[PDB]
Design a protein around this ligand. Structure first.
Ligand SMILES: [Cl-]
Ligand SMILES: [Cl-]
Ligand SMILES: [Cl-]
Ligand SMILES: [Cl-]
Ligand SMILES: [Zn+2]
Ligand SMILES: [Zn+2]
Ligand SMILES: [Zn+2]
Length: 52
């Protein structure tokens, strides 16, 4: 699973970084805790638009 971090997770990734991680971790921890979202082209396009 490719994710973009929304918050800093020490030892894992900083806000704005894009990293591939185990699906279980993404689904059960990162997404569950609101720390990241999937880095799909669609999500990235939407995130860029809001920042601008
Ligand atoms: Cl995977
Ligand atoms: Cl930071
Ligand atoms: Cl920081
Ligand atoms: Cl896992
Ligand atoms: Zn995966
Ligand atoms: Zn930070
Ligand atoms: Zn697991």
């Amino acid at each position: 699973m490719k994710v973009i971090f929304l918050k800093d997770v020490k030892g894992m990734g900083k806000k704005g970084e894009i990293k591939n991680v185990a699906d279980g971790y993404a689904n059960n921890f990162l997404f569950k805790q609101g720390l990241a979202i999937e880095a799909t082209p669609a999500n990235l396009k939407a995130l860029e638009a809001q920042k601008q």
